[PDB]
Design a protein around this ligand. Structure first.
Ligand SMILES: [Mg+2]
Ligand SMILES: [Mg+2]
Ligand SMILES: [Mg+2]
Ligand SMILES: [Mg+2]
Ligand SMILES: [Mg+2]
Ligand SMILES: [Mg+2]
Ligand SMILES: [Mg+2]
Ligand SMILES: [Mg+2]
Ligand SMILES: [Mg+2]
Ligand SMILES: [Mg+2]
Ligand SMILES: [Mg+2]
Ligand SMILES: [Mg+2]
Ligand SMILES: [Mg+2]
Ligand SMILES: [Mg+2]
Ligand SMILES: [Mg+2]
Ligand SMILES: [Mg+2]
Ligand SMILES: [Mg+2]
Ligand SMILES: [Mg+2]
Ligand SMILES: [Mg+2]
Ligand SMILES: [Mg+2]
Ligand SMILES: [Mg+2]
Ligand SMILES: [Mg+2]
Ligand SMILES: [Mg+2]
Ligand SMILES: [Mg+2]
Ligand SMILES: [Mg+2]
Ligand SMILES: [Mg+2]
Ligand SMILES: [Mg+2]
Ligand SMILES: [Mg+2]
Ligand SMILES: [Mg+2]
Ligand SMILES: [Mg+2]
Ligand SMILES: [Mg+2]
Ligand SMILES: [Mg+2]
Ligand SMILES: [Mg+2]
Ligand SMILES: [Mg+2]
Ligand SMILES: [Mg+2]
Ligand SMILES: [Mg+2]
Ligand SMILES: [Mg+2]
Ligand SMILES: [Mg+2]
Lengths: 54, 109, 119, 44
RNA sequence: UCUAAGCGGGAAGCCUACCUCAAGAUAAGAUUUCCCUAGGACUUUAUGUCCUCUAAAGAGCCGUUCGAGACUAGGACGUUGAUAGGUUGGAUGUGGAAGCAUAGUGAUAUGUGAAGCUGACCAAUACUAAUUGCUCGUGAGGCUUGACU
RNA sequence: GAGAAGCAUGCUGGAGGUAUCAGAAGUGCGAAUGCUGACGUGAGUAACGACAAAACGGGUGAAAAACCCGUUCGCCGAAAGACCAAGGGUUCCAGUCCAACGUUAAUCGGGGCUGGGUGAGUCGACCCCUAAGGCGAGGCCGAAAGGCGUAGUCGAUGGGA
RNA sequence: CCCACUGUCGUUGAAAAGCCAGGGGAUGACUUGUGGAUAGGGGUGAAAGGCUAAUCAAGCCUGGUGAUAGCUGGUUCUCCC
RNA sequence: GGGGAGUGAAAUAGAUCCUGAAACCGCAUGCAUACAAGCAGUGGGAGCACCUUUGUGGUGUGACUGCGUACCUUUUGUAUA
């Protein structure tokens, strides 16, 4: 139910050794020149040579 | 020469912000701005605010060029907590600490 | 186990799920471009393309089927006058699902759903 | 669950008020005590 | 005289034998195949450092997904494409749709017609979505002995 | 220096400190399930309070799953609707703000700030009348303090335009 | 409407006594609002030592009071015999 | 919320504002650490890094190795589970 001894600050940092974040897949849409998330519509509505909500 | 920006009193804990601060430490300023732009974490917004402020200070007060800049230093410290009460079952009461942080960015060529 | 099973649950009862997908189909047929979550968008194809396939033949039984399945007279009128004759010579694939980032208050993956030859 | 307080303002005054305490000797001693201690409110 | 020397038989038991795992077996094994062969300075003089040039074989991120799955990992595919959805045909289940016509006072019955509808199945089919990409991974791999050259 | 300890000096600090020899003590802390404050481990883990249920388009905004407008879907309907008494005390309405408060965000709010808002011969209270019960001039009783009670006077939950 | 016989759940609860599904009484020795009376060795009790403000084989608050404890715990700098 | 400018003797004297300790939590540099079993020290002792001198010097780290079951209390007697 509960610990008998407190955890050292070393064993607490050893558990967090898998807690790191990674980056996303970002590409340059040289149809428009901007940076965008791969396979996603850009911030203003562009994708692979088409524009939504002109 | 490093140019500094401080964001004192962010309403997040330092353990949550250190994860985003580890992602951009030592990178070029444009790449770090991209990483922060396309993040779903809440600490990314505050860290992007502090980084934008450091770039503006470097270019206005010190008159530096931006494509040469780097995120040379960044670290997160703890702020002062807010103490609150949470009623529990059977008449018991727990103490809630609402945590705070200080973000410090240093941009340099 | 889930071997070779189709359909979603999406946290709802069967009847709520049916009602929600019918509502989505009606909204799509009216506006022709809507924004939803990606798991809701990919299951909407399986609900909304059969209605267009059905509206390609304008008989009284087909229109009564479309009304039993949409319960919306404006949608039935738009299917058998506009949408059916537009795709009369297209062999399926009348929608388009496009990933569109994440929701602010939620961090939920979102998508655009649009009709193919709109505007 | 029904709890113990169950307020009524007439009964509050008739059990604990100023005239109730002034109508006996031990109540006048309650009032003398509470004036010696410096309370900002003598009674309920 | 079965034992002291020497030579044997003997059980669902032991070791093999059958199935599964297994080189972190730190002694980290083997076999087939594939990839990398640019220049300058330089001194803490050695698998030494610095600057331009280079970025392979491959792996991963991402996407469409699975008879694989808690998250992972693992399998398949990403336009020179059937990976998923839809579309078209088939199969299956249910059991005689709607409209119309006829017979009947009516409930209803009959014909049109085993009709209409039919999740997850089989087969075809680029109609929709699998992109223009990015990151990692280098530039022949110390020394000493002994054999072949 | 045998020890409790002492001496010198760099940095910070910004106004007091004190030899020697006597004198007086709130004179030395690790423990008392000791007392007060602060901060850890558990752990970014359990949980986010009725299984009535949501979806989309537009607006405003720095930012919208949650606010406003619209179009649909769903739930209660002897209650999850309307109204009095008690209790509370401005929560009511408008403009404006979003730090804290709201188990998430909030542009919203029963939150902050600035103004506004409750109109009676007939509704109610007060008022006249009394029940139970209280207090009670004189009076009876009691070391004192005090107890009971007559005439009276109060006291609605009941009677009176 | 008043009650509380059984069971599952809940037991750092939605809750310091509940929910849900069933259960009993339901014109009476009934249920209930408002006001009042009884006060601690006392009251009240179709009686279980029950209740008397989440407290009952003698309520709570202040005082006597720093009660007493042949019991348990704790007791702080250095050196020498 | 900060960065310049400006005030002031002083701004890590800037309003949570004299001084600013410890527990606790970061970032940076050096060395060690992914074939090895236990109160984490102690006696040895190689290597590396930085200062310095021409060192049988100083500072940090510590491969490998002998020995080694916390403190208080109470007990005949406690690593004591
Ligand atoms: Mg650390
Ligand atoms: Mg409570
Ligand atoms: Mg499948
Ligand atoms: Mg869910
Ligand atoms: Mg139903
Ligand atoms: Mg078919
Ligand atoms: Mg039918
Ligand atoms: Mg003392
Ligand atoms: Mg202490
Ligand atoms: Mg202590
Ligand atoms: Mg755990
Ligand atoms: Mg868990
Ligand atoms: Mg959970
Ligand atoms: Mg809720
Ligand atoms: Mg009913
Ligand atoms: Mg109501
Ligand atoms: Mg209001
Ligand atoms: Mg909030
Ligand atoms: Mg208000
Ligand atoms: Mg009056
Ligand atoms: Mg009397
Ligand atoms: Mg008298
Ligand atoms: Mg009267
Ligand atoms: Mg009345
Ligand atoms: Mg029940
Ligand atoms: Mg009955
Ligand atoms: Mg008593
Ligand atoms: Mg008596
Ligand atoms: Mg007694
Ligand atoms: Mg004492
Ligand atoms: Mg200072
Ligand atoms: Mg200070
Ligand atoms: Mg090793
Ligand atoms: Mg061990
Ligand atoms: Mg003993
Ligand atoms: Mg013993
Ligand atoms: Mg021993
Ligand atoms: Mg043990």
């Amino acid at each position: 139910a509960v610990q008998q001894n407190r955890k050292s600050r070393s064993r607490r940092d050893m558990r967090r050794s898998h807690d790191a974040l990674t980056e996303n897949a970002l590409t340059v849409d040289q149809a428009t020149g901007e940076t965008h998330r791969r396979h996603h519509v850009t911030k203003d509505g562009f994708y692979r040579g088409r524009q939504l909500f002109a | 020469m490093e140019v500094t920006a401080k964001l004192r009193g962010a309403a997040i804990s330092a353990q949550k912000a250190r994860l985003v601060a580890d992602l951009i430490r030592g990178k070029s300023v444009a790449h770090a701005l991209n990483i922060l732009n396309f993040s779903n974490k809440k600490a990314a917004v505050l860290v992007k605010k502090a980084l934008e402020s450091a770039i503006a200070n470097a270019e206005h007060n010190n008159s530096l060029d931006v494509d040469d800049l780097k995120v040379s230093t960044i670290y997160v410290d703890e702020g002062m907590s807010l103490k609150r009460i949470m009623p529990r079952a059977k008449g018991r009461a727990d103490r809630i600490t609402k945590r705070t942080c200080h973000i410090t960015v240093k941009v340099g060529v | 186990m889930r071997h070779r099973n189709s359909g979603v649950k999406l946290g709802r009862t069967s009847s709520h799920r049916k009602a929600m997908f019918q509502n989505l189909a009606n909204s799509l047929f009216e506006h022709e471009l809507i924004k939803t979550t990606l798991p809701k968008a990919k299951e909407l194809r399986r609900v909304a393309e059969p209605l267009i396939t059905l509206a390609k033949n304008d008989t009284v039984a087909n229109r009564r089927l479309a009304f039993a399945r949409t319960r919306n007279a404006a949608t039935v009128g738009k299917l058998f006058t506009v949408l059916g004759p537009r795709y009369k010579e297209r062999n399926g694939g009348y929608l388009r699902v496009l990933k569109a980032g994440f929701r602010a208050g939620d961090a939920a993956p979102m998508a655009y759903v649009e009709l193919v030859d709109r505007e | 669950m029904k709890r113990t307080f169950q307020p009524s303002e007439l009964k509050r005054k008739r059990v604990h008020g100023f005239r109730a305490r002034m109508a006996t000797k031990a109540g006048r001693q309650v009032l003398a005590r509470r004036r010696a201690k410096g309370r900002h409110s003598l009674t309920v």
